[PDB]
């Protein structure tokens, strides 16, 4: 059966690049479309984007092209890079397949000068 | 089941293909016409050992699992048999995932050859919708 | 972008009673509206896909209906395990968008 899990730093500094990893176990990443979704402090959900089987990506314009979603078949993982983060990027990040049947546990990432 | 042109246009509209991911309804009716001639039970065995199934001729190598195709990926996470029903639900669900890839409707060779670039809306005109 | 508006923002109910949650779209999205449930400290869980299609493993008390711009998620006989947030999401056009959510609480 399929399992997804996010990993990466939980604390980052303003202006840096936030990077997260989603490890997929149970099947190959080449057998589905993969997405990233995030939840802001006020129960506001935002669909960040997804990468489909051809390698094509779809990113939410709200991110102003600061996002990159890539894959690594050998490691059966896919990633999220978000450049020049600000405090507005503090949120709980989740990885999930395009169908929405499989989700990671989610990981909180806080952006602060501290 | 062999759908009538207008009958399928109405069904596809009820199944949310009127303006799905930038594609007007006519695209889907035209695609069904040239892919399967509106026949939900249509199947076509391919050279690579894969088979195209249903009204939208979905391939067994990338989209559905028929358990008889080599490097199957089952991108639609569904058994190919489900795509052979008179009920177009499964075929529409899978077609939506297919078209959500950057290649869009180009995944459908008949559509690419007989529909793309033509007045596709003509396929829904003269119909009660 | 397609804007999804959910109501009510909050709904308190007594277990055993039924409820209906609303989600309206700024433009027609056909049947391309999905429903998610989310509890504190947990990831979203898909309850209904394409407005009314059932999902294996979800309690039968959950049902969805609607098309075009008006959709509803119904829960027949709310159970304690149903309290939490409910969000609708459209997949008709990119970018996919979520409604603001409805919080279901015990009365």
Contact B20 C32 (CB under 8 A): yes
Residue B72: closest CA among chain A residues belongs to which residue?
Answer: A31
Residue-number span of the structural domain to which C59 is assigned: 1-107
**Parent domain of A97:** 1-114
DSSP-derived letter for residue B75 is: T
From B18, B35, B48, B66, active-site residue: B35
Contact between residue B37 and residue B54 where contact means Cβ atoms under 8 Å apart: no
- Residue B125: its H or E element: none
Partners of residue A39 in chain C, C-beta under 8 Å: 38
| Least Cα separation, residue C18 to chain A (angstroms) | 24
Neighbours of chain C (3+ CB pairs under 8 A): A, B
Residue in C43, C45, C87 closest to A105 by CB: C43
Judged by phi (left if over 0) then psi (alpha if -120 to 50, else beta), residue C86 lies in: beta
Q: Looking at chain B, which residue has its C-alpha nearest residue A27?
A: B73
Known active-site residue B52:
yes
Annotated catalytic residue: which of B52, B66, B87, B119? B52
Domains of chain B: 1-129 (1.10.530.10)
Question: Closest-CA residue in chain A for C56?
Answer: A101
Task: Verify whether the Cβ–Cβ distance B75 to A53 is below 8 Å.
Answer: yes
Dihedral over Cα of B58, B62, B63, B69: its sign = positive
Kindly state the DSSP code that residue B117 receives in the 8-state scheme. T
Q: What strands lie across the sheet with A11-12, from one edge to the other?
A: A11-12, A107-111, A91-97, A34-40, A44-51, A57-59
> Distance (Å) from the C-alpha of residue B21 to the closest C-alpha of chain C?
5
HEC readout, chain C = CCCEEEECCEEEECCCCCEEEEEEECCCCCCCEEEEEECCCCCCEEEEECCCEECCCCCCCEEEEEECCEEEEEECCCCHHHCEEEEEEECCCCCCEECCCEEEEEC
Q: What's the total number of domains in chain A?
A: 1
Vertex B88 angle, CA A56 and C34, to 5°: 60
In chain A, % helix, strand, coil (3-state, to 5) comes to: 10, 50, 40
CATH no. for residue C87? 2.60.40.10
Enumerate the residues of chain A whose CB falls inside 8 A of the CB of residue C103. 43
A40 to chain C: nearest residue by CA? C100
Tell me the residues of chain C between 40 and 99 that have a Cβ less than 8 Å away from chain A.
Answer: 42-46, 49, 55, 85, 87, 89, 94-98
Do A23 and A4 touch, CB atoms closer than 8 A?
yes
Cβ neighbours of residue B21 under 8 Å, at least 6 residues apart?
B96, B99, B100, B104, C92, C93, C94
Contact A54 B103 (CB under 8 A): yes
In chain B, count H helices and then E strands: 4, 5
Query: B22 to chain C nearest CA, in Å?
Result: 7
Question: Are A59 and A67 in contact, with CB atoms under 8 Å apart?
Answer: yes
What is the C-alpha to C-alpha distance for residues C50 and C58, in angstroms, rounded to an integer?
15
Domains of chain C: total? 1
For A12, A35, B107, C25, the CA distances from C91, given in Å and listed in that order, are 31, 13, 19, 12
Return the percent helix, strand and coil in chain B, to nearest 5: 40, 10, 45
Chain pair B-C, CB pairs under 8 angstroms: 35
Would the CB atoms of C95 and A101 count as touching at under 8 Å?
no
Which residues in chain B precede a discontinuity of more than 2.5 Å between C and N? none
Asked if B69 contacts B50 with a C-beta cutoff of 8 angstroms, the reply is yes
Phi, psi of C79 (to 5 degrees): -110, 160
Task: Give the CA distances from residue B35 to residues B40, B61, B114, in Å, rounded to whole numbers and listed in that order.
Answer: 10, 17, 10
> With 0-12 CB in 10 A as exposed, 13-18 as middle and 19+ as buried, what is B99?
buried
Q: Residue B18, annotated ligand binder?
A: no
Query: According to the entry, how was the structure determined?
Result: X-ray
Q: What is the distance between the alpha carbons of residues A108 and C41, in angstroms, rounded to a whole number? A: 10
Q: Is B48 a catalytic residue?
A: no
Q: Find the CATH number of the domain harbouring A40.
A: 2.60.40.10
Distance CA B33, CA A49 (A): 33
In degrees rounded to 5, what are phi and psi of residue C94? -90, 135
Best C35, C38, C41, C44 member to test A by mutation, with max A CBs in 10 Å, is C44
What value, to the nearest 5°, has the Cα angle with vertex A72 and ends A66 and A76?
Answer: 125
């Amino acid at each position: 059966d399929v399992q997804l899990q996010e990993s990466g730093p939980s604390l980052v500094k303003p202006s840096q690049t936030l990077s997260l990893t989603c490890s997929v176990t149970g099947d190959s990443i080449t057998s589905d479309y993969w997405s990233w979704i995030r939840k802001f402090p006020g129960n506001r959900l935002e669909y960040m984007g997804y990468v489909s089987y051809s390698g094509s990506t779809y990113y939410n314009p709200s991110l102003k092209s600061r996002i990159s979603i890539t894959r690594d078949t050998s490691k059966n993982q896919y990633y999220l890079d978000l450049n020049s983060v600000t405090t507005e990027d503090t949120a709980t990040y989740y990885c999930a397949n395009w169908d929405g049947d499989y989700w990671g546990q989610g990981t909180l990432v806080t952006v602060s000068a501290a | 089941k062999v759908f009538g042109r207008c009958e399928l246009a109405a069904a596809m509209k009820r199944h949310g293909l009127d303006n799905y991911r930038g594609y007007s309804l006519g695209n889907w009716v035209c695609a069904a016409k040239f892919e399967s001639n509106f026949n939900t039970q249509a199947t076509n065995r391919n050279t690579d050992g894969s088979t195209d199934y249903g009204i939208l001729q979905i391939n067994s190598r990338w989209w559905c699992n028929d358990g008889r195709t080599p490097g199957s990926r089952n991108l639609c996470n569904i058994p190919c048999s489900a795509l052979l029903s008179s009920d177009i639900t499964a075929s529409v669900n899978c077609a939506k995932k297919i078209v959500s890839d950057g290649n869009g409707m180009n995944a459908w060779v008949a559509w690419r050859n007989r529909c793309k670039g033509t007045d596709v809306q003509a396929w829904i005109r003269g119909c009660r919708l | 972008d397609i804007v999804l508006t959910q109501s009510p923002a909050t709904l308190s109910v007594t277990p055993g009673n039924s409820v209906s949650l609303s989600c309206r779209a700024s433009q027609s999205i056909g049947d391309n509206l999905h429903w998610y449930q989310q509890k504190s400290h947990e990831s979203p869980r898909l309850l209904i896909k394409y407005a009314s299609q059932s999902i294996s493993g979800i309690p039968s008390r959950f049902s969805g209906s609607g098309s075009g711009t008006d959709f509803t998620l119904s829960i027949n006989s709310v159970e304690t395990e149903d309290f939490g947030m409910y969000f609708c999401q459209q997949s008709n056009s990119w970018p996919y968008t979520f409604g603001g959510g409805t919080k279901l609480e015990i009365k």
